């Protein structure tokens, strides 16, 4: 009986093994049999289209969507009730509009995969109406446990015979819906940008789900126009999904929670315990070097305070030093995670900046090696007055014991950035390769990985990748009106009056990015902020492989900045101890975060001279 | 016999995403190629009511792209394009034009 519950998720998982399949095969077939099986690597795509929507409806259905919560610490019992009522209607709205310009994308396109002679790619675009059919039950199925848990004012049947008319306007009588336009009653011309932007950002801090709220404010441009957009973003919005690096992202979180909950974490621990512990500072020095391990290991922010929290809390409380201390360098060993592969942010930025993940992560290794070493010089600069007791001494017998026993784990993240770093291997299969890697090892040198774990992991990598598909899908529709109406061009006009430097914008757009982390969460402010400024920057000539790591940076100085810091929280739930503690504990660590992020920012040859000496 | 040459000059932005294309059209249309470039390998690809006498160059680091045609026959006259069709593997020509576009320009012989 259980299985009945999320038949469509299992599909999804039934799908997602079939592409981890398809490319394992791929990558070592493709050098030992000598010629590409080029279906292969098309089919994926498509793959990914189905396994990406399926995940939006996890994502719909649990109502775990990524928002701005701000005004509701504010605001009183009724007030939300209205509110809470009124941006989930708007969201009922936004699937409609959905739907809608989902079945008037279908029937104008005819177009074939002539990369293999043609057969059926209507089967894309088709997936976005029958998976948002799937999206409607869903959706309306959890407003009614958001109004039996008193959230709202309305009952389904509200939505139910709404649905219907809507439908049936269409069906018999459209000319009533061409009423709807506000086209009777305005002359905005160019201005029309400015209040595009005031309405979307007025319904994002209303606290609309971030990209509904980017639908909201696109289908809003609509009543400015005369004209095409119906079309025009209509094709590209499901489509944009199609796109290749986007695949790694999946495999890389899948290999995350493969490695971690493996308990490979206390192995990389008690093997930094003797290479690094035996210089006294020790408790630091394993924590910050391990770090870029544990990164490698982990794949995001979270799942490095996670995972290794347990083990570095009981080090330092076994060595009896103080909990700010364990709080400050355990937040920067988590601002470690996103420098290195794997980074969900960083490859996001890669997507919505449609640059290469290869020329990016070859890049944030450098800043990899800078922010570790700093962090390594503020340990010492601390320890050496503050007075903490000298560590143990080693010998080789069994510093090289634990090395044996350790060693076919550690090859994890040397697995990932070397195959890239040597230009044998691209992104996906690096990703698809570390996962085989960890599940063969954790298979037959390890034991704790069950015959379901693979599929318990993938549903849970698969729902992630959901939020991640309907966030680039909503600002690749942003990437309509901003090319469309050249908001570079009146943005530029304020700063061009005066305009002189990049480094002038550079601290200024960190400055705004900062300002905003301190009151937007990373996971939503990364596409608020991005899908413009990174125009704005290239308005203003800057190399966006230097704007990528340099803004991403910022996201981690974000996520580390209180009030909004969610990993300062985190660190909390693992210390058991107050944000006072933790808020002293981080206060020192980021002064070396921001020279850092100065250097690079007033020179950019640093990152510039390894890609560019390797890549050219 | 004659041959001119139209080009994408890289001005400002990123082009080497590993796409590039290029594009003609109607009176009354918006929907016309010739098909991908590739910056790897040489690989040229085009649609077969294009095959033919159209033909293929480029430059990553001083980023400069250009198409040379060769037919000189009636049919080939049209409004011109290049585009930044980028990130989008199914189609040819689509709208998979993500990034960005020339405001088109006018080639034209006639007898």
């Known amino acids: 009986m259980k299985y009945i519950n999320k038949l469509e998720e299992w599909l999804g998982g039934a799908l997602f093994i079939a592409i981890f399949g398809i490319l394992i095969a791929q990558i070592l077939s493709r050098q030992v049999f000598h010629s590409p099986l080029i279906w292969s690597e098309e089919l994926a795509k498509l793959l990914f289209v189905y396994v990406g929507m399926l995940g939006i409806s996890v994502a719909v259905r649990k109502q775990e969507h990524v928002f701005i919560d701000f005004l509701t610490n504010l605001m009183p019992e009724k007030i939300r009730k209205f509110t809470n009522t009124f941006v989930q209607l708007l969201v009922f709205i936004c699937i409609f509009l959905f739907i809608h310009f989902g079945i008037r994308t279908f029937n104008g396109a005819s177009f074939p995969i002539d990369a293999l002679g043609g057969i059926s790619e209507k089967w894309i675009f088709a997936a976005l109406p029958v998976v948002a059919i799937l999206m409607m039950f869903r959706f309306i199925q959890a407003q009614t446990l958001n109004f039996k848990t008193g959230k709202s004012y309305l009952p389904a049947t509200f939505f139910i015979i709404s649905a219907v008319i809507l439908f049936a306007i269409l069906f018999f009588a459209p000319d009533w819906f061409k009423v709807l336009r506000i086209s009777n009653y305005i002359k905005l011309g160019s201005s029309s940008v400015y209040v595009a932007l005031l309405v979307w950002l007025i319904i994002m801090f209303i606290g609309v789900p971030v990209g509904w709220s980017l639908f909201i404010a696109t289908l809003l441009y609509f009543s400015m126009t005369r004209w095409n957009v119906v079309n025009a973003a209509t094709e590209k919005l499901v489509y944009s999904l199609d796109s290749f690096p986007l695949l790694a992202v999946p495999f890389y979180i899948l290999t995350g929670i493969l490695m971690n909950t493996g308990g490979i974490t206390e192995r990389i621990f008690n093997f930094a315990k003797a290479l690094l512990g035996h210089y006294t500072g020790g408790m630091g020095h394993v924590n910050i070097g391990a770090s870029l391990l544990f990164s490698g290991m982990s794949g995001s922010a979270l799942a490095d305070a996670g995972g290794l929290g347990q083990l570095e809390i009981k080090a330092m409380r076994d060595a009896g030093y103080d909990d700010d201390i364990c709080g400050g360098i355990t937040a920067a060993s988590c601002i470690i995670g996103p420098l290195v592969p794997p980074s969900i942010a960083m490859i996001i930025y890669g997507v919505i900046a449609n640059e290469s993940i290869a020329k990016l992560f070859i890049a944030g290794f450098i800043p990899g090696v800078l922010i570790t070493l700093a962090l390594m010089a503020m340990n010492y600069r601390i320890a050496k007055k503050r007075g903490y007791p000298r560590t143990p001494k080693a010998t080789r017998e069994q510093l090289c014991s634990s090395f044996k026993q350790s060693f076919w784990a550690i090859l994890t993240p040397l697995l990932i950035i070397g195959g890239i770093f040597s230009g044998l291997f691209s992104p996906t299969e690096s990703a698809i390769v570390a996962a085989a890697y960890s599940v063969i090892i954790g298979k037959f040198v390890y034991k704790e990985l069950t015959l379901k774990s693979l599929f318990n992991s993938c549903i849970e990598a698969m729902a992630i990748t959901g939020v991640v598909a309907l966030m680039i899908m909503t600002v690749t529709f942003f990437g309509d009106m901003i090319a469309r109406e050249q908001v570079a061009m009146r943005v530029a006009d304020v700063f061009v009056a005066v305009a002189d430097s990049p480094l002038t914008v550079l601290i200024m757009i960190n400055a705004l990015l900062l300002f905003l982390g301190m009151f937007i969460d990373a996971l939503a402010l990364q596409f608020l902020v991005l899908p413009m400024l990174i125009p704005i920057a290239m308005q203003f000539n800057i190399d966006l492989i230097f704007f990528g790591v340099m803004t991403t940076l910022n996201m981690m100085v974000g996520i580390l900045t209180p009030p909004m810091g969610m990993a300062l929280f985190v660190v909390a739930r693992v210390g058991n101890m107050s944000v006072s503690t933790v808020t002293k504990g981080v206060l020192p660590f980021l002064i070396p975060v921001f020279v850092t992020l100065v250097l690079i920012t007033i020179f950019p040859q640093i990152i510039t001279f390894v890609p560019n000496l390797l890549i050219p | 016999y004659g041959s001119l040459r139209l080009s994408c000059t890289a001005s400002?932005?990123?082009?080497?995403?590993?796409?590039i294309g290029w594009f003609r059209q109607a009176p009354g249309k918006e929907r016309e190629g010739v098909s991908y470039?590739?910056?790897?390998?040489?690989?040229?690809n085009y649609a077969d009511s294009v095959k033919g006498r159209f033909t293929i160059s480029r430059d990553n680091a001083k980023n400069t792209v250009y198409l040379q045609m060769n037919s000189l026959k009636p049919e080939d006259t049209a409004v011109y394009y290049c585009?930044?069709?980028?990130?989008?593997?199914?189609?040819?020509?689509?709208?998979?034009?993500?990034?960005?576009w020339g405001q088109g320009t006018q080639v034209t012989v006639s007898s």
């Open positions: 585009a930044r069709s980028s990130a989008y593997g199914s189609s040819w020509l689509n709208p998979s034009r993500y990034d960005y």
């Open positions: 400002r932005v990123t082009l080497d995403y590993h796409d």
């Open positions: 470039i590739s910056s790897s390998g040489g690989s040229t």
